[PDB]
Amino acid sequence: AGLAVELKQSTAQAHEKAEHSTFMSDLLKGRLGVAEFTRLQEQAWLFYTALEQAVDAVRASGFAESLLDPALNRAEVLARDLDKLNGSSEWRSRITASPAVIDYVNRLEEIRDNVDGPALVAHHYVRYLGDLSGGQVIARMMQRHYGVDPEALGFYHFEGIAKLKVYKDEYREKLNNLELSDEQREHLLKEATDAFVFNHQVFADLGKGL
Ligand code: NA
Ligand code: NA
């Protein structure tokens, strides 16, 4: 099976086992509010900042360069959104990572330091393919349920991508064309499972008030 198909199959499997949470479900159906949305995006700034440091190192090494499109970068975008949500820049020195986010960030930093291309591609897949599918849709829900201004929703729009549907097809084809040893491939698939698990834990912690 192509890598894109195998990764879809690691996702699916990881969903069962996942610690169940209702944070995102509640958020998207209008049961929470702007505060809880802001808490999510503060955690996201931490992990997208870590992720993108890792992406930068792996790209600079010359691994998977075409997949690692800098137009995907979200961290600075999130910071601009948070400046709007919080009213100031202060939040940068005051946000505290949940225990799940600490563990996630620690993995992403280890990947950066090791310049681990296969592991980075796994995390890139888990974060960005989900973002490229869940966008305009989540943003609209935040506008509709909670009146969040578009100025605070820039995370959901990729300025550099004209045609999202085609972009996702190209992305999956780039995955299918990545040259990997059997060992790198096995490592990448394992890491994709781990990344999905980190992600579920972030939401479980948000759902506990952590
Ligand atoms: Na779940
Ligand atoms: Na959901």
CSV table of C-alpha atoms and ligand atoms in Angstrom, one decimal:
chain,number,residue,atom,x,y,z
A,1,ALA,CA,0.0,0.0,0.0
A,2,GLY,CA,1.2,3.6,-0.6
A,3,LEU,CA,2.3,5.5,2.4
A,4,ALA,CA,-0.7,7.9,2.2
A,5,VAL,CA,-3.0,4.8,2.5
A,6,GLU,CA,-1.0,3.2,5.3
A,7,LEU,CA,-1.0,6.4,7.3
A,8,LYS,CA,-4.8,6.8,6.9
A,9,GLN,CA,-4.8,3.2,8.4
A,10,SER,CA,-2.6,4.2,11.4
A,11,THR,CA,-4.9,7.2,12.2
A,12,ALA,CA,-8.0,5.0,12.1
A,13,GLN,CA,-6.5,2.4,14.4
A,14,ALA,CA,-5.2,5.0,16.9
A,15,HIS,CA,-8.7,6.5,17.3
A,16,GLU,CA,-9.8,3.3,19.2
A,17,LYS,CA,-7.7,3.3,22.3
A,18,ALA,CA,-7.8,7.1,22.4
A,19,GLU,CA,-8.8,8.5,25.8
A,20,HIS,CA,-12.3,9.9,25.0
A,21,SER,CA,-13.0,13.6,25.5
A,22,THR,CA,-15.7,16.0,24.7
A,23,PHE,CA,-13.7,19.2,24.6
A,24,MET,CA,-13.6,19.6,20.9
A,25,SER,CA,-17.2,18.3,20.4
A,26,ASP,CA,-18.5,20.8,23.0
A,27,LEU,CA,-16.5,23.7,21.5
A,28,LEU,CA,-17.7,23.1,18.0
A,29,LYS,CA,-21.4,22.7,18.9
A,30,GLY,CA,-21.5,26.0,20.8
A,31,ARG,CA,-21.4,24.6,24.4
A,32,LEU,CA,-18.2,26.5,25.4
A,33,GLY,CA,-17.0,29.9,24.5
A,34,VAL,CA,-14.3,32.3,23.4
A,35,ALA,CA,-12.3,31.6,26.6
A,36,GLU,CA,-12.0,27.8,25.8
A,37,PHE,CA,-11.2,28.6,22.2
A,38,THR,CA,-8.4,30.9,23.3
A,39,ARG,CA,-7.0,28.2,25.7
A,40,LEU,CA,-6.9,25.7,22.7
A,41,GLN,CA,-5.1,28.2,20.5
A,42,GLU,CA,-2.5,29.1,23.2
A,43,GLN,CA,-1.7,25.4,23.5
A,44,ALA,CA,-1.6,25.2,19.7
A,45,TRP,CA,0.9,28.1,19.6
A,46,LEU,CA,3.2,26.0,21.9
A,47,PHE,CA,3.1,22.9,19.8
A,48,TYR,CA,3.0,24.5,16.3
A,49,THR,CA,6.1,26.5,17.4
A,50,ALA,CA,7.9,23.2,18.4
A,51,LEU,CA,6.6,21.5,15.3
A,52,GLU,CA,7.8,24.2,13.0
A,53,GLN,CA,11.3,24.4,14.6
A,54,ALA,CA,11.5,20.6,13.8
A,55,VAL,CA,10.2,21.2,10.2
A,56,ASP,CA,12.8,23.9,9.7
A,57,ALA,CA,15.7,21.6,10.8
A,58,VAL,CA,14.5,18.7,8.7
A,59,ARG,CA,13.9,20.8,5.6
A,60,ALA,CA,17.3,22.5,6.0
A,61,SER,CA,18.9,19.0,6.1
A,62,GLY,CA,17.4,18.3,2.6
A,63,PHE,CA,14.8,15.8,3.6
A,64,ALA,CA,11.2,15.8,2.1
A,65,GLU,CA,11.7,19.5,1.0
A,66,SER,CA,8.7,19.6,-1.3
A,67,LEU,CA,6.4,18.2,1.4
A,68,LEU,CA,7.6,20.7,3.9
A,69,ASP,CA,6.0,23.7,2.4
A,70,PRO,CA,6.6,26.8,4.5
A,71,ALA,CA,3.2,28.2,3.4
A,72,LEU,CA,1.8,25.6,6.0
A,73,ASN,CA,3.5,27.4,8.9
A,74,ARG,CA,0.9,28.4,11.5
A,75,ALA,CA,2.8,29.5,14.6
A,76,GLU,CA,3.1,33.2,13.7
A,77,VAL,CA,-0.4,33.3,12.5
A,78,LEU,CA,-1.6,31.8,15.8
A,79,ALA,CA,0.5,34.5,17.7
A,80,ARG,CA,-1.4,37.2,15.6
A,81,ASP,CA,-4.7,35.6,16.5
A,82,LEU,CA,-3.8,35.4,20.1
A,83,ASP,CA,-2.8,39.1,20.2
A,84,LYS,CA,-6.3,39.8,19.1
A,85,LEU,CA,-8.0,37.3,21.4
A,86,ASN,CA,-6.0,38.4,24.5
A,87,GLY,CA,-5.8,42.1,23.7
A,88,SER,CA,-2.0,42.2,24.2
A,89,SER,CA,1.4,40.4,23.7
A,90,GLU,CA,1.6,39.5,27.4
A,91,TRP,CA,0.3,36.0,27.0
A,92,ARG,CA,3.6,34.8,25.5
A,93,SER,CA,5.2,34.8,29.0
A,94,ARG,CA,2.1,33.6,30.9
A,95,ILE,CA,0.7,30.5,29.1
A,96,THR,CA,1.4,27.2,30.8
A,97,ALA,CA,1.5,24.0,28.9
A,98,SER,CA,-0.7,21.1,29.9
A,99,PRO,CA,1.1,17.9,30.9
A,100,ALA,CA,0.1,16.4,27.4
A,101,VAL,CA,1.4,19.5,25.6
A,102,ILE,CA,4.7,19.2,27.6
A,103,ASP,CA,5.1,15.6,26.4
A,104,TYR,CA,4.1,16.5,22.8
A,105,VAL,CA,6.5,19.4,22.7
A,106,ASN,CA,9.3,17.3,24.2
A,107,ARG,CA,8.9,14.8,21.4
A,108,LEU,CA,8.9,17.5,18.7
A,109,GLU,CA,12.1,19.0,20.2
A,110,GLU,CA,13.7,15.5,20.3
A,111,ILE,CA,12.8,15.1,16.6
A,112,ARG,CA,14.3,18.6,15.9
A,113,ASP,CA,17.5,17.8,17.7
A,114,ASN,CA,17.9,14.4,16.0
A,115,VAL,CA,16.9,15.9,12.6
A,116,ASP,CA,14.7,12.9,12.4
A,117,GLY,CA,13.0,13.2,8.9
A,118,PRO,CA,10.7,10.2,9.0
A,119,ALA,CA,9.4,11.1,12.5
A,120,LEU,CA,8.9,14.8,11.5
A,121,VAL,CA,6.9,13.7,8.4
A,122,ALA,CA,4.6,11.7,10.7
A,123,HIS,CA,3.9,14.7,12.9
A,124,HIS,CA,3.5,17.0,9.8
A,125,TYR,CA,0.9,14.6,8.4
A,126,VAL,CA,-1.1,14.4,11.8
A,127,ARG,CA,-1.2,18.3,12.2
A,128,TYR,CA,-1.4,19.7,8.7
A,129,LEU,CA,-3.6,17.2,6.7
A,130,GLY,CA,-6.1,17.6,9.5
A,131,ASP,CA,-5.8,21.4,9.3
A,132,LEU,CA,-6.2,21.4,5.5
A,133,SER,CA,-9.4,19.5,5.9
A,134,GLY,CA,-10.9,21.2,9.1
A,135,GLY,CA,-10.6,24.8,8.3
A,136,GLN,CA,-13.2,27.1,7.1
A,137,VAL,CA,-15.6,24.9,8.8
A,138,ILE,CA,-14.2,25.3,12.3
A,139,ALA,CA,-13.7,29.0,11.8
A,140,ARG,CA,-17.3,29.4,10.8
A,141,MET,CA,-18.4,27.6,13.8
A,142,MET,CA,-16.4,29.9,16.0
A,143,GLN,CA,-18.0,33.0,14.2
A,144,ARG,CA,-21.5,31.5,14.4
A,145,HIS,CA,-21.6,30.1,17.9
A,146,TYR,CA,-19.4,32.7,19.7
A,147,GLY,CA,-19.0,35.7,17.5
A,148,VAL,CA,-15.2,35.4,17.2
A,149,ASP,CA,-13.9,38.0,14.7
A,150,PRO,CA,-12.1,36.9,11.5
A,151,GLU,CA,-9.1,38.7,12.8
A,152,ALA,CA,-8.8,36.0,15.4
A,153,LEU,CA,-9.3,33.1,13.0
A,154,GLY,CA,-6.3,33.4,10.7
A,155,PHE,CA,-5.0,30.0,11.8
A,156,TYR,CA,-7.8,28.5,9.7
A,157,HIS,CA,-6.8,30.1,6.4
A,158,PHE,CA,-3.7,29.2,4.5
A,159,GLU,CA,-2.7,32.5,2.6
A,160,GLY,CA,-0.4,30.7,0.3
A,161,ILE,CA,-2.8,28.0,-1.0
A,162,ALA,CA,-5.2,28.8,-3.8
A,163,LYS,CA,-6.8,25.4,-4.3
A,164,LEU,CA,-7.1,23.3,-1.1
A,165,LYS,CA,-8.6,20.2,-2.7
A,166,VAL,CA,-5.7,19.9,-5.3
A,167,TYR,CA,-3.1,20.7,-2.6
A,168,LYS,CA,-4.3,17.7,-0.5
A,169,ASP,CA,-4.1,15.4,-3.5
A,170,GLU,CA,-0.5,16.6,-4.2
A,171,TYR,CA,0.3,16.2,-0.5
A,172,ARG,CA,-0.8,12.6,-0.5
A,173,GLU,CA,1.2,12.0,-3.8
A,174,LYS,CA,4.3,13.6,-2.2
A,175,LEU,CA,3.9,11.1,0.8
A,176,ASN,CA,3.5,8.2,-1.7
A,177,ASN,CA,6.7,9.3,-3.4
A,178,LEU,CA,9.0,9.8,-0.4
A,179,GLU,CA,12.1,7.5,-0.6
A,180,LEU,CA,12.4,5.6,2.7
A,181,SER,CA,14.3,2.5,3.9
A,182,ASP,CA,12.0,-0.2,5.4
A,183,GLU,CA,13.2,0.8,8.8
A,184,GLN,CA,12.5,4.6,8.2
A,185,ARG,CA,9.0,3.7,6.9
A,186,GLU,CA,8.2,1.5,9.9
A,187,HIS,CA,9.5,4.3,12.2
A,188,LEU,CA,7.4,6.9,10.4
A,189,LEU,CA,4.2,4.8,10.8
A,190,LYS,CA,4.9,4.2,14.5
A,191,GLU,CA,5.4,7.9,15.0
A,192,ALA,CA,2.2,8.7,13.2
A,193,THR,CA,0.3,6.6,15.8
A,194,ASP,CA,2.2,8.3,18.6
A,195,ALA,CA,1.4,11.8,17.1
A,196,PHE,CA,-2.3,10.9,17.0
A,197,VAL,CA,-2.1,9.8,20.6
A,198,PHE,CA,-0.4,13.0,21.7
A,199,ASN,CA,-3.1,14.9,19.9
A,200,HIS,CA,-5.9,13.0,21.7
A,201,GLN,CA,-4.1,13.6,25.1
A,202,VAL,CA,-3.9,17.4,24.4
A,203,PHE,CA,-7.7,17.4,24.0
A,204,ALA,CA,-8.3,15.2,27.0
A,205,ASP,CA,-6.2,17.6,29.1
A,206,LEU,CA,-8.2,20.6,27.8
A,207,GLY,CA,-11.4,18.7,28.7
A,208,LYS,CA,-10.1,18.3,32.3
A,209,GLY,CA,-9.2,22.0,32.7
A,210,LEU,CA,-5.5,21.2,32.6
B,1,NA,NA,-11.5,10.0,20.9
B,2,NA,NA,-15.1,16.8,16.9
